[PDB]
Curated annotation (Swiss-Prot), chain A:
Organism name: Mycolicibacterium smegmatis (strain ATCC 700084 / mc(2)155)
Entry coiled-coil feature ranges: none
Domain of life: Bacteria
Skewed-composition ranges (Basic residues): 1-41
PANTHER family: 54S RIBOSOMAL PROTEIN BL35M, LARGE RIBOSOMAL SUBUNIT PROTEIN BL35M
Gene label: rpmI
Biased composition (Polar residues): 47-57
Protein name, as recorded: Large ribosomal subunit protein bL35
Lineage: Bacteria, Bacillati, Actinomycetota, Actinomycetes, Mycobacteriales
NCBIfam families registered for this protein in UniProt: rpmI_bact
GO terms, biological process: translation
Keywords: Ribonucleoprotein, Ribosomal protein
InterPro entries in UniProt: Ribosomal_bL35, Ribosomal_bL35-like, Ribosomal_bL35_CS, Ribosomal_bL35_sf
GO cellular component: cytosolic large ribosomal subunit
Molecular functions (GO terms): structural constituent of ribosome
Swiss-Prot record, chain B:
Domain of life: Bacteria
Molecular functions (GO terms): rRNA binding; structural constituent of ribosome
Oligomeric and partner information: Part of the 50S ribosomal subunit.
Protein name as annotated: Large ribosomal subunit protein uL4
Organism: Mycolicibacterium smegmatis (strain ATCC 700084 / mc(2)155)
Keywords annotated in UniProt: Ribonucleoprotein, Ribosomal protein, RNA-binding, rRNA-binding
Phylogenetic lineage: Bacteria, Bacillati, Actinomycetota, Actinomycetes, Mycobacteriales
Gene name of the record: rplD
Swiss-Prot record, chain C:
Family statement drawn from the similarity comment of this UniProt entry: Belongs to the universal ribosomal protein uL24 family.
Keyword Ribosomal protein: yes
Gene source species: Mycolicibacterium smegmatis (strain ATCC 700084 / mc(2)155)
Annotated protein name in UniProt: Large ribosomal subunit protein uL24
Keywords: Ribonucleoprotein, Ribosomal protein, RNA-binding, rRNA-binding
Cited PROSITE patterns: RIBOSOMAL_L24
GO BP: translation
InterPro entries: KOW (IPR005824), Rib_uL2_dom2 (IPR014722), Ribosomal_uL24 (IPR003256), Ribosomal_uL24_CS (IPR005825), Ribosomal_uL24_KOW (IPR041988), Translation_prot_SH3-like_sf (IPR008991)
Task performed by this protein: One of two assembly initiator proteins, it binds directly to the 5'-end of the 23S rRNA, where it nucleates assembly of the 50S subunit.
HAMAP family hit by this protein: Ribosomal_uL24_B
GO MF term (any one): structural constituent of ribosome
Entry GO terms, CC: ribonucleoprotein complex; ribosome
Pfam families (alphabetical): KOW (PF00467), ribosomal_L24 (PF17136)
Subunit organization: Part of the 50S ribosomal subunit.
RNA sequence: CGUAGACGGUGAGAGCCCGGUACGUGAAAACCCGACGUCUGUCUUGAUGGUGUUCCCGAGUAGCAGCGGGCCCGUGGAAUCUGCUGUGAAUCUGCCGGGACCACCCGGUAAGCCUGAAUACUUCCCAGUGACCGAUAGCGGAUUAGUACCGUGAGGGAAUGGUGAAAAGUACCCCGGGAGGGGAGUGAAAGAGUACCUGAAACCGUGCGCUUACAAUCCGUCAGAGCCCUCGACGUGUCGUGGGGUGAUGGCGUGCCUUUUGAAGAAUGAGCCUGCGAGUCAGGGACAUGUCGCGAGGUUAACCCGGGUGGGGUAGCCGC
RNA sequence: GGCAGCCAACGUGUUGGCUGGGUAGGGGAGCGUCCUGCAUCCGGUGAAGCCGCCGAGUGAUCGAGUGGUGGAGGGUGUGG
């Protein structure tokens, strides 16, 4: 039985060239009128997964 | 370059066979040969050892008695593992023990075993094992005694050499195989390795070309 | 089973090794023969008396059919030319055993 | 000689199985599981986080699409070309595969900034600007085929 | 000398004692696949390769709509396939598919069609194999076994192997109603007696040694008086580097396990012994830690061949 | 006096000196059992098992020491 990858984790996380798992940031989907553009710029782009969550996110991506 | 003088059963001596260094002068690797031999024995192993789990043991479907009141331990099946006659929890089940040892590992282990035999001068070459078309274990035994005195000898002869195979097969420690099936387990198990000339040339061609 | 009743055999194994005797009974179902004066047993038969020295069936393996010359011999076969019969033959002298 | 009884695993190769739950001198009783709980009798799923929105559900799904028609290329660098062909000569997909610079059946894209110093007739599916510049400076010929 | 040391049996490890084994080989009859026959439709009775314009040629089907099924596709932009309901196309300038459509196009010619062998499985039969079990195991079933027994019934469902090489299975006598014994005999051995291989523990005695009826004991442990045997100075019982027990008496001493902040706990479990009873296996699964091969390469999967564990197999996968 | 990591040494690195209560738990190293490849030994001149004696090891435990019973297998080494 092949280890199935977690669909949600695969859709929410990516690995860079060096293997860094990257993710997008929450609170940037709607309710944006009250959010200053500095906040949305902070929430923009991709950030490396926190070391605490890295183990479980790797588990979900690999199997 | 290592040389093996072809010995004829007649007592005379035909020419000699060169042993390629890449095939008979390799440095034996104990760990590699051990892994290859263990994989060979695992492949040989017939994993037909089986038991019955609690679900496979007959009966046991019904709960033996009430959950409460009887004053006895709670049971859900008379075939639970703790029960006498119940199923085996983690008992053997049929399994294939063979391993997918890499081709390079297998070939290198065989070449190292044959190299050890060559370095210790345990490799012999013979035109044939008996003169004539009728097999003769007497003649084969005399010729093998002439060649070597060690108990176990791996006889590597061609498939068409049925006369030699039949002649030599019933000797207690002699093991007979073909050059294409040559393998580290047999090479190491045998004190000496007696190639036929055709078998040795076939092995060298197959491993050099 | 190459050992029949009425043919004398040599006990080649057992306590009575080297003793000749005529086969009284054959037991192919269990590969045993009752040889005369071989494998004596002191049985406590009621009869009032004491022990009687009977014969116990010895395994057919422990005997060899005696050759015409008196020597033990393995039993082979030869197909006759008159009737096509297969007569027992002795591996030693090749005579009708 | 080396017989079968002379074969041993490599030092540090084999390690004893941790046979758990065999007396208190080893990982006994609870077998390393500790006292009561879920984990005392089973494995907690990896995606479970105690009931709070898991990370893989509170984080937004990565933006974009995958483009099932994408034309990805197997890349070769002119530095690898130099290492593989110090004398020069024609270069194409066949000999790139032979030298082990690209996959056997793929769209090869040549490229590079690693000081191409050999006149080479390189024929790949595509080239980069620096690939063409390096080929020309070295005196070779880039061909898209 | 064995072209036959496979495996068993035989009074204990047998290639040469026996069944056999490698291999001299064998079928009247019956049943399975081969060659030649009788037997079975189509032609020479102008087609057969070229010529050429025009007419005719597979339906309640395709399509569509509603509601469903199934496809990665959970109705979604929803294609292809399909059930039911309704409505319903011509003849190649046709029709269908390429996940709408002019179509540049390509592919194919459904519904009237139908029809082939080459891959799964084992009740049963034959020959085999096992780093499988070995009588609480292995099939429930080595034994009357789907039996006894239980249940109205469906159904549930056991326990029970070993004398000895050979019954040679203890004649005869004695005690005893017998049972069971004691002589005697058989046997290598009855320390093998149809209650039978070995014969553990629990448990139950009998004999001997020490101890114990003023004593408050988690039953032990540390001292320890007093009561027998192994070597000797000495010549004879008191010593010893010595060597086991039994324990007057003194000190200390709150079972084990589980589970708890915490249990000797008046919290849980255990009457005892023996046997059994719980992190195991599958998968190029995933993540981390010694070895082959590289030199950027490692590998093969299915599969093919080998009487094996061996040789091929580049598809793919991972690095790049 | 006896046993368990680090340091110095000059040379083969095994000697000396600085080191350790433990539940969950982690790591390391081992004892015993069975089955096995190969090697090699013991065994009806008595294997295993069982009951002891005498001892032994830091532990699991040991017994190619030994007595009794026993009657056919077993030990050791290195691997699986």
């Amino acid at each position: 039985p092949k280890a199935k990858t977690h669909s949600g984790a695969s859709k929410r996380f990516r690995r860079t060239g060096t293997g860094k798992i990257v993710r997008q940031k929450a609170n940037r989907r709607h309710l944006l009128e009250h959010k200053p553009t500095k906040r949305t710029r902070r929430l923009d782009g991709r950030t490396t997964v926190s070391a605490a969550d890295n183990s479980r996110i790797n588990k979900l991506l690999n199997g | 370059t290592l040389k093996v003088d072809v010995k004829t059963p007649a007592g005379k001596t035909d020419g000699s066979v060169e042993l390629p260094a890449e095939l008979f002068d390799v440095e034996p690797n104990i760990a590699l040969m051990h892994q290859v031999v263990t994989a060979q024995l695992a492949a040989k192993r017939q994993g037909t050892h089986s038991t019955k789990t609690r679900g496979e043991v007959s009966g046991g479907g019904k709960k033996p008695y009430r959950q409460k009141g009887t004053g006895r331990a709670r049971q859900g099946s008379t075939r639970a593992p703790q029960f006498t006659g119940g199923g085996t929890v983690h008992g053997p089940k049929p399994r294939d023990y063979s391993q997918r040892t890499p081709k390079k590992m297998i070939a290198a282990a065989l070449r190292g075993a044959l190299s050890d035999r060559a370095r210790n001068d345990r490799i012999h070459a013979v035109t044939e094992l008996v003169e004539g078309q009728t097999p003769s274990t007497k003649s084969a035994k005399t010729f093998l005694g002439t060649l070597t005195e060690n108990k176990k000898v791996l006889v590597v002869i061609g498939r068409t050499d049925e006369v030699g195979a039949k002649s030599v097969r019933n000797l207690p420690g002699v093991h007979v195989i073909s050059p294409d099936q040559l393998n580290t387990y047999d090479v190491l198990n045998a004190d000496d390795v007696v190639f036929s000339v055709e078998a040795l040339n076939a092995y060298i061609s197959a491993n050099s070309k | 089973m190459k050992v029949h009743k009425g043919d004398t055999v040599l006990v080649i194994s057992g306590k009575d090794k080297g003793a000749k005797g005529k086969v009284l009974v054959a037991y192919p179902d269990r590969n045993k023969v009752l040889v005369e004066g071989v494998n004596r047993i002191k049985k406590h038969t009621a009869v009032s008396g004491g022990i009687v020295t009977q014969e116990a069936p010895i395994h057919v393996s422990n005997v060899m059919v005696v050759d015409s010359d008196g020597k033990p011999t393995r039993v082979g076969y030869r197909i006759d030319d008159e009737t096509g019969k297969k007569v027992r033959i002795a591996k030693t002298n090749g005579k009708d055993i | 000689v080396i017989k079968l009884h002379d074969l041993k695993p490599a030092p540090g190769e084999k390690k004893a199985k941790t046979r758990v739950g065999r007396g208190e001198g080893s990982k006994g009783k609870t077998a390393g599981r500790g006292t009561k709980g879920t984990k005392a009798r089973k494995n907690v799923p990896v995606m479970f986080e105690g009931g709070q929105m898991p990370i893989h559900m509170r984080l937004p799904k990565l933006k974009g699409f995958k483009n099932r028609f994408r034309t990805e290329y197997q890349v070769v660098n002119v530095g690898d070309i130099n290492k593989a062909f110090p004398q020069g000569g024609t270069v194409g997909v066949d000999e790139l595969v032979a030298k082990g610079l690209v996959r056997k059946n793929s769209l090869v894209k040549v490229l590079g900034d690693g000081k191409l110093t050999v006149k080479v007739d390189v024929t790949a599916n595509k080239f980069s600007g620096s690939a063409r510049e390096a080929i020309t400076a070295a005196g070779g010929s880039a061909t898209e085929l």
